[PDB]
Design a protein around this nucleic acid. Structure first.
Ligand SMILES: CN(C)[C@@H]1C(O)=C(C(N)=O)C(=O)[C@@]2(O)C(O)=C3C(=O)c4c(O)cccc4[C@@](C)(O)[C@H]3C[C@@H]12
Ligand SMILES: [K+]
Ligand SMILES: [K+]
Ligand SMILES: [K+]
Ligand SMILES: [K+]
Ligand SMILES: [K+]
Ligand SMILES: [K+]
Ligand SMILES: [K+]
Ligand SMILES: [K+]
Ligand SMILES: [K+]
Ligand SMILES: [K+]
Ligand SMILES: [K+]
Ligand SMILES: [K+]
Ligand SMILES: [K+]
Ligand SMILES: [K+]
Ligand SMILES: [K+]
Ligand SMILES: [K+]
Ligand SMILES: [K+]
Ligand SMILES: [K+]
Ligand SMILES: [K+]
Ligand SMILES: [K+]
Ligand SMILES: [Mg+2]
Ligand SMILES: [Mg+2]
Ligand SMILES: [Mg+2]
Ligand SMILES: [Mg+2]
Ligand SMILES: [Mg+2]
Ligand SMILES: [Mg+2]
Ligand SMILES: [Mg+2]
Ligand SMILES: [Mg+2]
Ligand SMILES: [Mg+2]
Ligand SMILES: [Mg+2]
Ligand SMILES: [Mg+2]
Ligand SMILES: [Mg+2]
Ligand SMILES: [Mg+2]
Ligand SMILES: [Mg+2]
Ligand SMILES: [Mg+2]
Ligand SMILES: [Mg+2]
Ligand SMILES: [Mg+2]
Ligand SMILES: [Mg+2]
Ligand SMILES: [Mg+2]
Ligand SMILES: [Mg+2]
Ligand SMILES: [Mg+2]
Ligand SMILES: [Mg+2]
Ligand SMILES: [Mg+2]
Ligand SMILES: [Mg+2]
Ligand SMILES: [Mg+2]
Ligand SMILES: [Mg+2]
Ligand SMILES: [Mg+2]
Ligand SMILES: [Mg+2]
Ligand SMILES: [Mg+2]
Ligand SMILES: [Mg+2]
Ligand SMILES: [Mg+2]
Ligand SMILES: [Mg+2]
Ligand SMILES: [Mg+2]
Ligand SMILES: [Mg+2]
Ligand SMILES: [Mg+2]
Ligand SMILES: [Mg+2]
Ligand SMILES: [Mg+2]
Ligand SMILES: [Mg+2]
Ligand SMILES: [Mg+2]
Ligand SMILES: [Mg+2]
Ligand SMILES: [Mg+2]
Ligand SMILES: [Mg+2]
Ligand SMILES: [Mg+2]
Ligand SMILES: [Mg+2]
Ligand SMILES: [Mg+2]
Ligand SMILES: [Mg+2]
Ligand SMILES: [Mg+2]
Ligand SMILES: [Mg+2]
Ligand SMILES: [Mg+2]
Ligand SMILES: [Mg+2]
Ligand SMILES: [Mg+2]
Ligand SMILES: [Mg+2]
Ligand SMILES: [Mg+2]
Ligand SMILES: [Mg+2]
Ligand SMILES: [Mg+2]
Lengths: 114, 129
RNA sequence: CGGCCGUAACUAUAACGGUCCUAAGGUAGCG
RNA sequence: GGUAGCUAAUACCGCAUAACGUCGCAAGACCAAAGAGGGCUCUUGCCAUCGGAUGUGCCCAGAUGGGAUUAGCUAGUAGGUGGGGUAACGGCUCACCUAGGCGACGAUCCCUAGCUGGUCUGAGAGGAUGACCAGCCACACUGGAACUGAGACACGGUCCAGACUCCUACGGGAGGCAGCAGUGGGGAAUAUUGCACAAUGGGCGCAAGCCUGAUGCAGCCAUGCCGCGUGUAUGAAGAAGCCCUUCGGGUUGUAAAGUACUUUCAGCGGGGAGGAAGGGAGUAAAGUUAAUACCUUUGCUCAUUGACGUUACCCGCAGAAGAAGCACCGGCUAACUCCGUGCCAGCAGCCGCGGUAAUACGGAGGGUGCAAGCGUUAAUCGGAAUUACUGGGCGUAAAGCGCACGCAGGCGGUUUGUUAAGUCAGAUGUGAAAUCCCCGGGCUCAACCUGGGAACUGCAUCUGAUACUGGCAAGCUUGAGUCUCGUAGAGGGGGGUAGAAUUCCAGGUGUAGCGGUGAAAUGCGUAGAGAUCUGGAGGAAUACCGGUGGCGAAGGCGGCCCCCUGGACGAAGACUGACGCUCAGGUGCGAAAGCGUGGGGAGCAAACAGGAUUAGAUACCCUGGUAGUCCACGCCGUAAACGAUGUCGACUUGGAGGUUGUGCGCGUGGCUUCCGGAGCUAACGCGUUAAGUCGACCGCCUGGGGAGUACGGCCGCAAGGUUAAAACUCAAAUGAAUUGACGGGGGCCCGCAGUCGUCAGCUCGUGUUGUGAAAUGUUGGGUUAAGUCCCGCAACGAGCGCAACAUGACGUCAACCCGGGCCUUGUACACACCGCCCGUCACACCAUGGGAGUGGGUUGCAAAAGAAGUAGGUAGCUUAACCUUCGGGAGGGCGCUUACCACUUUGUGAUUCAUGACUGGGGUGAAGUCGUAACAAGGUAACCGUAGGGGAACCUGCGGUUGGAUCA
């Protein structure tokens, strides 16, 4: 572009609303299949946030305690093999329990020190 | 149309050197002669001469050292589409001082070194190395 | 300016297929 | 609150005085004040005027977000004159006059937003940001208003209205934490209803002092930064217990224990700065003074002032005692093993990991990194030259408008003079302090605090410089243009005409077939076709010439003749004198299809019909055939409108052609084609007709999709065109080239045509070529059963195969037909054609368009409304100060009234957000249904525009493109 042209004319987590976490209520809790090449029953949940956005959130770790009308804290973080799953649930915050019988990376799964 | 005779002079030199021409000729002007004088004095060209009166032609004798052309680079800086002027403290160093910038000052066309010693800024015509 | 029956990896429906017959089986649009 | 009476002043009001004050040209006229305190004197206050200082009001220029899918906006509007108004200039206001003013240098409208010093990031230029600290602004429950005052249209003042909420005897009243603390609520999330005025500052006061949620401090919180601790030394028994192990051992690990010690910090007990300056007492002298008085100042001495606070800090006591976690260990990335699990459970920033020997999941052992923190999420800059000013691109990756003319704008050949706007130099003023940076200083160090400097890249003014750019003046001829003579040309528009052929019609001759295909059939024909001859009608196109030929801006243009007309080129001068280049917006031209009206209609041919083909065949093939193709006029405005290459100018080795001028075989112009050098390019390639080297200006790109789609605007008769998003979704999509494999590609050969296969292949070293994957050798000309051999050759040699003396190369299969070899070519294949892959349909989920409408926000316009306030007026009522002839008067107040105006009301638009039966496509999701459109000649070359048709991919017509294979 020429100088004269430039003179004339110069040169993933939206539901958080630039907050580190948002609280929400589980409107559905289910499993879903990952895309190829993966195979599992991945534990997700639809969540209506305190700002009115409804989003799918991932429930990480081995075994969870969430129903419909469970109150959870979500954070950012997509799940690569579930298209349109852009958030993770924080384990050991609010209703969502710590992962049972974890001993490594305990602080990532809300598990108090044995 | 022809809108920058100085860029044309620099290009004639650049292309002349790349083609191993002994000399290059062009339509003369007072500013072209002033620049040719700086190139001669700094030892980039061997000689120049103006011939004519109504239509004067400037001839520049190019110089080669060990086969290689001596003017290894020559680039227009200030140009009609974007004029470039520098204060004395902001005068450019070409090739860490080993090259020259040709500067038009209120005391005539001279090298950046001569401008800096005279305490003058001016228009940066071209870089030569 | 048509019937009949079947058919999709949850069901449901049938883009599809078969079969019969017609001069031709109602298109676009609308309901 | 009301009534009546009473009283004071530094409250209030005349009078006097009245000029370096106000008004006035002057003469003149006119305007003020307050006392109090200590012992006549001192101190302090009061009034006037002119200054200072400080603060504040006002004006101008530049700078300071986004949107044109906002282009016109404005009637006190723009200016003038006069009156009024203000502290003050001013449409500030009003009357009159003029018709202005603003706007593509973005007005108006819409959206977002407190601004700055700075802050974060960055090498810088930038980008992001404006919390804390400091400057400025604005606001104080919401809307409005003034009053008081030096100052307010006033956070803890007044009045009114409104929405809330609370007290009430129901008549009325009351309130405003966006001060500090605190409560509820919202939220992922942010603290005590603390102590003190001791210090600094502020108000009042002569002072003492009083007030001060400013401030100084304390509380809470790892929120950050910085410092310190959680022991130190020894210590092989290499103890157990771990864990791993080829059972040798290894490692944790000198780790632990044990044994010497140490005691910071925490706890407990004793000592002890500094933040205190001052203020209060009588005394000391001097200065005021009637005075050795009071007062003032300075000394003089004696008591005394700390919220923090059980302060900092110091000393002593006891004993390792009270004090280590978090993440990570597949690559990127520092750190590896075993066990459990078995595409599950789960992990994941990206690539990926997990289907029975998982360094990737989960645990353990070991290890790595950080450490009172560590991780995760969010957010900004960086890396990202990935918006490129510094600092990028556009032949094929995304990207040159289809082509031109041209206004604004940008840019401008050459010489002299002048100017001094840009530019440059110097000086002066300013650029707050803090911050950053440098050299120092102070807290034990550090963080932190702090002295001076540097910096603040800027802005303004003044004085100079004059090369370059600009302005002005005068030129110049080289760019650009005019003229003269001539040349070639399917350049354009209009009209005429010729010959060949097809079809049709009429007639003759003639007789059983014709036509068509891969083969058929439909069709035509004994009602005489087809064939052949003669005559006639009509339309459309112009064989040969004909050419990588010519002309045109592009689209395009082809018989011959005439008429009108545009451009190009050459020769030799003459002429004008920069008149130029580019061009957003604008305007024009613009293939084919299509559209409108009127004609025309031979041939051809979308649609359509029938016949075939096929599993089907809405196709390809056949027989027909309507629009259309043709003409006139108007519209459309698009094409692979392509050289996928914008226009103009300059420069830079060669070779071979074509075409068209021209000067003397030899020159010299124009246009054009092929090859190739340097150089350039990712490569392919381009290469004086550049994609090389430069300059001017324009257009355009910013991952693939969603989408050239939606919405809005504009245009169109319509078809549609043009401008042009977002949500959402993926980690790729893409270009060129390489090795294979494959082809219903080409060439040349072979075989009765465990495995491929006894097929003649498969490789390596070194050299050389290529940025590289790779290539060469091994290809080529011959010849052979044979990579057999010969000859050539950037290759030179060698190995395993062949051969020679049954023998199975390197490897493959996680064992005309068929098979195979060599060269070449296309490829979207690499799980390598048993490949890849397209669309409808079906299912699930996600975002989204349209949509009768439905509910809010904001806002334009036109009116209504009129609380309080201020101003104007004033029949009524009323009255402290002044005047009075004592009756009253002046002036005031109240009430009333008018003007302006908030709440609010009504009607009608605009815009935006939310939502909506139903409806449209879009995206995502191992293995669904229907076909097979594309990739090979993909089995009908593909694709572009357009039109019609069809379950779907698509098919068919017309024109266009090569980004098509084939030719032996
Ligand atoms: C704010 N700004 C002016 C935006 C803009 O720059 C646009 C553009 N093409 O550059 C718009 O189209 C923009 O102007 C514009 O028009 C927008 C839209 O029309 C819509 C519509 O209609 C519906 C959904 C989303 C949008 C949108 C997000 O794309 C709008 C963006 C607009
Ligand atoms: K997997
Ligand atoms: K006004
Ligand atoms: K006026
Ligand atoms: K800034
Ligand atoms: K307000
Ligand atoms: K006052
Ligand atoms: K105080
Ligand atoms: K640039
Ligand atoms: K000048
Ligand atoms: K122009
Ligand atoms: K027809
Ligand atoms: K290459
Ligand atoms: K352009
Ligand atoms: K995207
Ligand atoms: K080699
Ligand atoms: K082949
Ligand atoms: K919908
Ligand atoms: K709506
Ligand atoms: K096809
Ligand atoms: K077509
Ligand atoms: Mg008074
Ligand atoms: Mg008086
Ligand atoms: Mg936009
Ligand atoms: Mg829009
Ligand atoms: Mg006036
Ligand atoms: Mg004004
Ligand atoms: Mg705001
Ligand atoms: Mg950078
Ligand atoms: Mg602020
Ligand atoms: Mg800003
Ligand atoms: Mg006042
Ligand atoms: Mg107040
Ligand atoms: Mg308050
Ligand atoms: Mg508060
Ligand atoms: Mg809450
Ligand atoms: Mg008080
Ligand atoms: Mg490593
Ligand atoms: Mg295992
Ligand atoms: Mg981040
Ligand atoms: Mg950048
Ligand atoms: Mg790029
Ligand atoms: Mg392409
Ligand atoms: Mg492209
Ligand atoms: Mg073009
Ligand atoms: Mg032009
Ligand atoms: Mg010039
Ligand atoms: Mg100047
Ligand atoms: Mg400063
Ligand atoms: Mg000049
Ligand atoms: Mg002509
Ligand atoms: Mg005509
Ligand atoms: Mg046509
Ligand atoms: Mg027509
Ligand atoms: Mg036909
Ligand atoms: Mg046909
Ligand atoms: Mg186009
Ligand atoms: Mg064309
Ligand atoms: Mg072409
Ligand atoms: Mg194009
Ligand atoms: Mg031409
Ligand atoms: Mg070439
Ligand atoms: Mg469109
Ligand atoms: Mg549109
Ligand atoms: Mg071979
Ligand atoms: Mg051999
Ligand atoms: Mg050979
Ligand atoms: Mg043998
Ligand atoms: Mg062979
Ligand atoms: Mg809707
Ligand atoms: Mg009123
Ligand atoms: Mg096909
Ligand atoms: Mg095909
Ligand atoms: Mg093809
Ligand atoms: Mg199109
Ligand atoms: Mg068809």
């Amino acid at each position: 572009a020429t100088v004269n042209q430039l003179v004339r004319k110069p040169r993933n987590v939206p539901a958080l609303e630039a907050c580190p976490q948002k609280r929400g209520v589980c409107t559905r809790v289910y499993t879903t299949t990952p895309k190829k090449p993966n195979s599992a029953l991945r534990k997700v949940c639809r969540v209506r946030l305190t700002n009115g956005f409804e989003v799918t959130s991932y429930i990480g770790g081995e075994g969870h305690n969430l129903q419909e009308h469970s109150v959870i804290l979500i954070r950012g973080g997509r799940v690569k093999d579930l298209p349109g799953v852009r958030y993770h649930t924080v384990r050991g915050a609010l209703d969502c329990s710590g992962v049972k019988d974890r001993k490594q990376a305990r602080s990532k799964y809300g598990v108090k020190r044995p | 149309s022809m809108q920058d005779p100085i860029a044309d002079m620099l290009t004639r030199i650049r292309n002349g050197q790349a083609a191993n021409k002994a000399a290059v000729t062009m339509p003369s002007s007072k500013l072209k002669v002033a620049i040719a004088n700086v190139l001669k004095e700094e030892g980039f060209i061997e000689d120049f001469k103006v011939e004519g009166d109504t239509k004067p032609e400037l001839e520049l004798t190019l110089k080669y050292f060990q086969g290689k052309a001596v003017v290894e680079s020559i680039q227009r800086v200030s140009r009609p589409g974007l004029r470039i002027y520098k204060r004395k403290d902001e005068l450019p160093k070409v090739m860490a001082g080993l090259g020259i910038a040709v500067v038009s000052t209120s005391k005539g066309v001279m090298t950046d070194r001569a401008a800096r010693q005279a305490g003058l800024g001016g228009e940066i015509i071209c870089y030569v190395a």
